[PDB]
A paper describes a structure:
FRHs catalyze the reversible H2 oxidation coupled to the reduction of coenzyme F420 (8‐hydroxy‐5‐deazaflavin, ΔG°′ = −10 kJ mol−1). The overall reaction requires three components: the large subunit (FRHA) that harbors the [NiFe] center and oxidizes H2, and the small subunit (FRHG), which contains three [4Fe–4S] clusters to transfer electrons to the flavin adenine dinucleotide (FAD) located in the F420‐reducing module (FRHB, harboring an additional [4Fe–4S] cluster). FRHABG dimerizes and forms dodecameric assemblies of about 16 nm in diameter with a spherical shape and a hollow core. Here, by characterizing the native hydrogenase from the marine methanogen Methanothermococcus thermolithotrophicus (belonging to the Methanococcales order), we provided an unprecedented functional understanding of this enzyme via a synergistic approach of biochemistry, X‐ray crystallography, and spectroscopy.
Further depiction of the active site was done on the MtFRHdimer2 form, as it exhibits the highest resolution of 1.65 Å. The deeply buried active site of MtFRHdimer2 is similar to the structure described by Ilina et al., with a distorted seesaw geometry of the [NiFe] center and an apparent vacant site between the two metals. The ligand‐to‐metal distances are in the range of the MbFRH structure, albeit with some shifts, particularly between the Cys66‐Ni and Cys387‐Ni. However, the trans S–Ni–S angles (105° and 176°) and a short Ni–Fe distance of 2.65 Å, which are crucial for efficient hydrogen activation, are almost identical to those in MbFRH (108°, 170°, and 2.70 Å intermetallic distance). Notably, we did not observe a partially occupied ordered water molecule in between the metals as modeled in the high‐resolution structure (1.45 Å) of the Nia‐S state of Hyd‐1 from E. coli by Carr et al. This discrepancy might originate from the slightly better resolution or the presence of additional redox states with a bridging ligand in the Hyd‐1 structure, as indicated by an additional CN− signal and overlapping CO bands in the corresponding infrared (IR) spectrum. Moreover, IR and RR spectroscopy confirmed the presence of the Nia‐S state, previously observed in MbFRH. This state was postulated to be mandatory for the thermodynamically favorable binding of H2 and corroborated the vacant position observed in the crystal structure. Nevertheless, the comparison of Fe‐containing MtFRHdimer2 and Fe‐depleted MtFRHcube does not reveal any structural rearrangement of the surrounding residues or the ones in the vicinity of the [NiFe] site. Therefore, the importance of the additional Fe site in modulating the redox properties of the [NiFe] center remains to be experimentally investigated.
Numbering used by the authors:
A (entry chain B), E (entry chain B): 1 to 72, 77 to 282
B (entry chain A), F (entry chain A): 2 to 393
C (entry chain C), D (entry chain C): 2 to 241
The structure:
């Protein structure tokens, strides 16, 4: 059972821009990459999640650094990919998504029936690690009725150390056991066989790296060229993942735990005759 | 005498046949050009559908000029409902139509290139056409959402604003298109004026002559106040063809004040640019010159467009079930008319389309008379016929 | 490889999409031999001269390798019926090019009554009458998809083509395909790629799920072709 | 004959339609033995008393002859899944009663997110999970259709039931079924009986042809069940 | 090959009411039956064709004698059958239709999924003979461009003696060969195996009987009871079909010609894989 | 002490469970009644659909009381859009709702007959119920188009006029229903007053007592001006059940001014007919008396109705995307609320439903406390619960 898919290198990294690091709980790789690209003409638009005051999200085509800094539950990022290259005119588009969204992106590039003049405009495809997603009202139950915190009082949410975390605007930090959140997961997530966004140009997540840092997989030539430009310009700080704690072993465990679990669900669905991707 | 039947004719869109009566020398005495394409029946199946479906459906008349039908449809429905599209929506809509014509006219020049372009020039010629088509389709994709069937063309205006960056990219491309168009014009005009095919065949002087008038309402967009629709009557094939041929024809026969009329670039050029030359070669020439008119107007629109201007009217799609809305547009191949009656729920009560090539088919039937039958297809192609358009 | 474009009850937009390879079209047309296409070439011309008539006909040539068939078949038109069977008879590989040919598309809404052929009312995808080897959905399919399909056919990339060989067995498509096969089956993860694929903008993502505006759907099949929770062959996992 | 009403994700309207045999319901209930129906009888009660708990459960009884199953299955609800499999296990004959059970019907539009079970989002007709022996479409099927189906089942009128045995193999329905299978195939003669069959008035006859108002269609299947150009078994030709 | 389906008796008949006979070119059986029923409470509503000034038809639920006398190409009669028993409240509904419409009526009565409380309200089901139908614009071409007569100038149309007939409001009568009309027929008619409306309670047509008279098949007990009431009341004049010319032999020939022809089309469709009713 | 769980409960609509904590004598100390029906999620899937689809979809909440949801839905959307239904449309709409309640209340009496009607009377009793239901459903079929999910209930009024003949047939049937109702009332009232089950079990005096108030806005239709919707707040199961039980509940918890409230016939009777009796038997009694109120009002409507009166407003279905429309209706089981925000294209931006049994479920949880657990299901059934309604 392959744990990470194919990649060229894997490092721990974080944005060198301290203002970016403040707006992100992890290494801020997506924002750093977007901003570096926009500011140097390597990207002319980037897809971000524009949430409202209720944690309700909406994908948006950002074209300025300020918009990226404002955008630092399902958000259908791929739904704006055509708008991005039509009325927004983007020719070097940055895309961000969970593994399933990166899967959708590779599918549309390979079989582009409804994607006239889209595939060649995708200049950087960034995947973020993902274990599961929740319907909004499922997450709302977790935070409000199991953690006892109002959604509008939320400034940071996180998963780690076997717990779900809510960081209140007013300073409080509350956490519960991960087993209490399982009943609220999107059950479509239970056939997902991709933890580290294996098909991205660059994949990034918090797990494997210390606080304020991200584990980054560089996978494709497009990803490697971009990442090397940011490193050479000083836009990222990079350390070997072998030097950081907890390290790549934690990423492997979580990825293999996901694939083992969801492989069981895929077989079960096949046994009772429900469809699965093939 | 002999009957000459050519079927199908080639290097235009769609399925037609020529049925000609010729004398012993082959000179055409009686001509018949007719669509034999099946009637998909858009006008009938739109009855009972919501107004918003009209531009989506009628775009599928034709994949060469789909913007023309979406534009006429939404203009007809807006007229029925007394909706006024906002000024920047109207600019975007005209820009979309111009982008479509900026691809269509070079496409036609490609379709006729086996007749007029020397073989040694063909590769370079086609590369230039395709460079121009790329820019035309880019405009339609950006403003209309898709180059082939544009969903942004809607009752009320245009669905999407473009950004200032997209406007500048279109402007850059228009400037490149203008340079290519200059080259294309200086190349083709001498050929069209030479009255010679690329195999040396001399063209007769009176090739494609006819005695009918012209309809055009605008040089680049359309203007419903320039036509008296009450004087447009559609007759049947039995009014212009012999019975054995009339029963084969798929199209109606449009007339103005009881007479056939030509539409298209030469119609527009006669009405607006003092170009009065008759015959078939003059059609090619007017089409070639029109490419420059189109890109100049596109750049004028880009200058005037406010990318933050409102593009859709907030006016509701409510008709009275009585008014016969009129939507006209100068398609690449000519004056294009859609009509619609809309009820209070915004649904289609009645729908009609009279398309550019619908007008020109019976004109062509006459135009091919008087010259050898070997030139009949060359006269057909001068009109850039779109049969799926003509038939819908 | 000898290729032909057969146009039935279509709009020629699928051919224009092929033309929107732009300069690359010349490369494509040099990797194959275009032996028939009424819109582009004067083939195959056969003359039958008698004492009273000269008949100059353009026929479909025999021995076509790949037929790109666009448009649906009008059951009430004898020529439409003859052409679809002739295309099948003369070609080794038949491609249903575009929604009209593959699943009916916009012609599903035809119901007759219009001059000057009011009898013309019944339109079907070609696979309701002939064997189809590959089907490309969309209205029209993109130039990129067409390039890929031609390249794969020339290189014998059967694996790439399998998804379209499978589609050729299904002559109906609809936005509700996303409901029936994905949302209702606990598979939709809300990527929104279906919405971006739709040519009429009939799909709206709401709260992470596709909402189909059915009166805007033209039954083109682009959305279910896209959805990665329906088809996701392993070849897509091979990246640069 | 022992019969049961199993209610999954339905609205109970199919049972009410049975109740709209009015006084004749008493005759029906005397020609069969109703052994299970949570809405109507206190069966099958099983008590499990321990030191700390008394559990009074109503279970589906074993050895059902005919199960009338109404509603669709919620894939994310464990009880819904258990009940559909239990109904199949315990019954010799399973009837998909009504559109929800037969083809999903209105529950095709479910997509989750609502309190107090936002995870509930995937609903399927029962035949996506179990073998169905007969399917009754409609939302709801009429009392008359139900009387006929019960009478035929009791009398062994397999010929009458064949149309519903055939329907049990198809778990999708849509107003566009009339287009795909009748209008597009040169079979629609314009009787207008489909329009009269539709519970939401989604079908309008225009110029002799059915026009489906797709945004009003609830995928009940009544129209294609009616259309005599689809199914017209010879038994219908036997008149008084 | 059975020619007429099942029946109890077959006669030649005509309305005794001379005003009815004036409004009908044939025996006026449908109008006589409708009017007799309404006037005696045997029917409380009847379905009629309400045409506009352009021969464009619309089905309508009539409840008065006057409405029937006003209504004396496809008209979808069965489309109003539910309206008739819901908001119109009809409990003894008269239905008229071509054979295919009577087929649809028997189907809905036998499998009444979408026809709650409809079947028992159908008190008289009258079928009219039919060889073929035309789309309106197909018929318009026949009359206007092959017979040379404006539609608005039409007061009577008829088929007989191998010809199609147009009776002008201004007195003219024009006719052409039936072979010239064949290209305009509704091709869905070409699988139709029913000429005399074999499934009706009462079936009636002009063929087989002299001018001003109709051939009437009485088929069911419901039809026989109704017809006998009209005869006993004097609402119809009846003669044996064996006594009238051309007689039942012409009906047999035309019916068998239809079934032979359309049987060939059904087999052809099966051969090429198009669907047919079964 | 012991836990008593009853699952499923029976002879009401839909799927619920009782979880009770009892003492050694079996007296209920803490009660929990809860829906465990799957959430079909109508409020969420209506977002993005046209307004006209709302009455069609929400009717499918429930096949017993579908008119109630179609009525609340169209009233909410009309309020959002400032549409006024014409007076005869409103009469027909109220008549449809009354017809539905004229079938529902006898149906409920049938469902409880195994508890209250002697076996030797059961056949005669059920025949009477079914005779009454036939008339109720006839009204809904005639006016609404179908008795089970009425398509004629539409934004703007009612889709169809009835004829004068249909009005007279309904009137005749109402008179017959009134005679049957008199017989049913004189039969059941003595039984409900006897405080005895048909097996001799004596009912405790304080059976089903609770301390909550009532909501009812009208005796037969609904009146949005009689409720302050700003004081209605929906809480979660975790606010009224223990955690192990709250995670099982499918419904929201409606409150008024922070408190639970009972809805239904006894609520209406307390507000309008000076009927203040507490307890569960008083619910059955008020329901029985209400049958007479309903048929009397139906006949009053028939007298006032002009069958040639306009039934649909011509006002367009155009909202501003901001106003929260309010639609209330007195369903058979009580005050029923739908809410909708509608945009300028007539599409649903937001949708909410608070259904009669949604209110009563947490009331029942308390009502079953204080008496033996063997009476808990009898208290449940006094409320005529519709769980598919409560859950939607
Ligand atoms: C549901 C979910 C589960 C995750 N689980 C894990 C996990 O188990 N382990 C782990 O290491 N990391 C996980 N992540 C990723 C993690 O939360 C960070 O997003 C990741 O470290 C990259 O953040 P960054 O600091 O590099 O980027 P930043 O600079 O913070 O930018 C983050 C980017 O993510 C985008 N984004 C936000 N929400 C979404 C969304 N719903 N869909 C798509 N794009 C979105 C934003 O638009 C933004 O551009 C998960 C993310 C999600 C959404
Ligand atoms: C398309 C067509 C073909 C026919 N072909 C033949 C034929 O080949 N031989 C033959 O003997 N008779 C044929 N008839 C029937 C014939 O025209 C007369 O209708 C028949 O003699 C009965 O008329 P009547 O005088 O008894 O009734 P009338 O008293 O004249 O009443 C006639 C009734 O027919 C109804 N009606 C009219 N048009 C339609 C329609 N399109 N669909 C359903 N009901 C309608 C009217 O509502 C009216 O109630 C055909 C009818 C049609 C519509
Ligand atoms: N140009 C053009 Fe079309 Ni294909 C034609 N003729 C449309 O209006
Ligand atoms: N009565 C009733 Fe319903 Ni089935 C409940 N509870 C609706 O509003
Ligand atoms: S677990 Fe898989 S399907 Fe679910 S959100 Fe994450 S990447 Fe998508
Ligand atoms: S699929 Fe679309 S683009 Fe292709 S022929 Fe059909 S209508 Fe035209
Ligand atoms: S593409 Fe498939 S998985 Fe993604 S949102 Fe659409 S239906 Fe759901
Ligand atoms: S929803 Fe859009 S993409 Fe899907 S079939 Fe319909 S038109 Fe095509
Ligand atoms: S088919 Fe219709 S009536 Fe029957 S359960 Fe489903 S929604 Fe209710
Ligand atoms: S029931 Fe069948 S034949 Fe009759 S109108 Fe409807 S689709 Fe056509
Ligand atoms: S059109 Fe009407 S009858 Fe046919 S499936 Fe849809 S709702 Fe049912
Ligand atoms: S020929 Fe048959 S299908 Fe055609 S109209 Fe007459 S009865 Fe109907
Ligand atoms: Fe970290
Ligand atoms: Fe037209
Ligand atoms: Fe006669
Ligand atoms: Fe609710």
């Amino acid at each position: 059972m392959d744990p990470f898919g194919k990649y060229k290198t894997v490092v721990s990294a974080r944005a060198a821009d301290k203002t970016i690091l403040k707006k992100c709980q992890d290494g801020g790789i997506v924002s750093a990459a977007y901003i570096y690209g926009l500011e140097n003409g390597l990207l002319d638009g980037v897809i971000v999640a524009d949430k409202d005051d209720k944690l309700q999200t909406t994908p948006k085509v950002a074209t300025t650094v300020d918009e990226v800094l404002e955008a630092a539950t399902v958000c259908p990022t791929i739904s704006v990919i055509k708008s991005a290259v039509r009325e927004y005119g983007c020719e070097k588009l940055g895309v961000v998504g969970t593994p399933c969204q990166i899967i959708a992106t590779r599918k549309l590039m390979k079989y582009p029936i409804g994607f006239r003049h889209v595939p060649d405009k995708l200049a950087l495809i960034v995947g973020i690690f993902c274990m599961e997603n929740f319907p909004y009202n499922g997450m709302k139950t977790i935070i409000e009725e199991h953690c006892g915190i109002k959604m509008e009082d939320v400034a940071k949410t996180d998963i780690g150390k076997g717990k779900f975390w809510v960081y209140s605007k007013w300073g409080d930090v509350k956490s519960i056991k991960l087993k209490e959140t399982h009943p609220y997961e999107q059950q479509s997530c239970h056939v997902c066989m991709d933890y580290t966004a294996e098909l991205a140009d660059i994949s990034t997540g918090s797990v494997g790296s210390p606080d304020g840092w991200s584990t980054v997989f560089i996978r494709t030539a497009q990803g490697e060229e971009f990442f090397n430009k940011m490193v050479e310009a000083g836009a990222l700080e990079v350390k070997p993942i072998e030097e950081v704690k907890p390290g790549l072993g934690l990423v492997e465990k979580l990825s293999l735990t996901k694939k083992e679990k969801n492989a069981k669900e895929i077989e079960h669905r096949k046994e009772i005759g429900l469809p699965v991707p093939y | 005498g002999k009957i000459v039947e050519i079927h199908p004719t080639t290097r235009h869109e769609g399925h037609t046949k020529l049925v000609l009566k010729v004398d012993d020398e082959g000179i055409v005495e009686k001509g018949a050009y007719l669509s034999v394409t099946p009637v998909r029946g858009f006008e009938k199946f739109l009855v009972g559908k919501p107004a918003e479906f009209a531009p989506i459906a009628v775009s599928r008349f034709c994949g060469i000029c789909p913007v023309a039908h979406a534009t006429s449809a939404v203009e007809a429905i807006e007229d029925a409902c007394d909706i006024t599209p906002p000024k920047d929506g109207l600019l975007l809509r005209e820009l979309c139509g111009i982008g479509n014509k900026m691809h269509s006219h070079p496409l036609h020049q490609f379709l006729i290139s086996p007749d007029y372009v020397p073989k040694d020039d063909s590769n370079e010629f086609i590369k230039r056409v395709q460079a121009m088509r790329r820019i035309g389709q880019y405009i339609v994709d950006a403003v209309g959402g898709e180059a082939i069937h544009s969903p942004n063309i809607k009752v009320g205006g245009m669905a999407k604003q473009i950004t200032e960056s997209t406007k500048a990219k279109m402007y850059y491309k228009c400037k490149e298109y203008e340079k290519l168009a200059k080259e294309q014009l200086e190349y083709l005009i001498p050929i069209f004026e030479s009255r010679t095919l690329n195999d040396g065949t001399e063209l007769p002087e009176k090739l494609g002559y006819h005695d009918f008038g012209y309809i055009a309402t605008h040089p680049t967009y359309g203007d419903r106040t320039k036509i008296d629709q009450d004087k447009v009557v559609e007759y049947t094939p039995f009014d212009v063809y012999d019975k054995d041929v009339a029963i084969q024809s798929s199209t109606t026969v449009p007339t103005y004040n009881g007479r056939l009329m030509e539409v298209g670039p030469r119609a527009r050029f006669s009405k607006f640019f003092d170009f009065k030359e008759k015959g078939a070669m003059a059609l090619h020439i007017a089409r070639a010159y029109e490419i420059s008119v189109l890109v100049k107007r596109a750049m004028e629109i880009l200058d005037e467009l406010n990318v933050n201007g409102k593009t859709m009217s907030d006016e509701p799609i409510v008709g009275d079930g009585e008014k016969l809305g009129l939507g006209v547009h100068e398609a690449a191949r000519g004056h294009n008319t859609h009509q619609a009656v809309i009820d209070k729920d915004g649904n289609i009560v009645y729908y009609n389309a009279i398309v550019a090539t619908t007008w020109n088919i019976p004109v062509i039937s006459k135009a091919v008379e008087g010259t050898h039958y070997k030139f009949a297809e060359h006269i057909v192609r001068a009109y850039d016929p779109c049969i799926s358009c003509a038939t819908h | 490889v000898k290729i032909a474009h057969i146009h039935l009850c279509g709009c020629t937009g699928c051919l224009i999409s092929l033309a929107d390879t732009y300069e690359q079209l010349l490369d494509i047309l040099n990797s194959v031999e275009l032996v028939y296409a009424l819109t582009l070439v004067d083939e195959k011309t056969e003359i039958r001269e008698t004492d009273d008539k000269i008949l100059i006909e353009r026929e479909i040539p025999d021995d076509i390798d790949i037929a790109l068939v666009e448009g649906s078949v009008c059951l009430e038109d004898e020529h439409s019926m003859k052409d679809v069977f002739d295309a099948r008879r003369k070609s080794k590989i038949v491609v249903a090019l575009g929604a009209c040919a593959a699943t009916g598309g916009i012609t599903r809404f035809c119901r007759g009554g219009q001059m000057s052929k009011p009898v013309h009312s019944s339109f079907v995808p070609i696979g309701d009458l002939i064997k189809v080897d590959l089907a490309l959905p969309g209205c029209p399919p993109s130039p990129e998809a067409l390039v890929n399909l031609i390249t794969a056919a020339l290189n014998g990339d059967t694996e790439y083509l399998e998804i379209y060989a499978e589609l050729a067995k299904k002559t109906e498509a609809c936005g509700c395909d996303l409901l029936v096969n994905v949302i209702n089956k606990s598979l939709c993860m809300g990527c929104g790629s279906c919405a971006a694929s739709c040519p009429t903008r009939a799909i709206e993502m709401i709260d992470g799920k596709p909402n189909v505006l059915k009166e805007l759907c033209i039954k083109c099949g682009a959305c279910s072709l896209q959805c990665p929770r329906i088809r996701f062959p392993k070849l897509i996992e091979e990246i640069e």
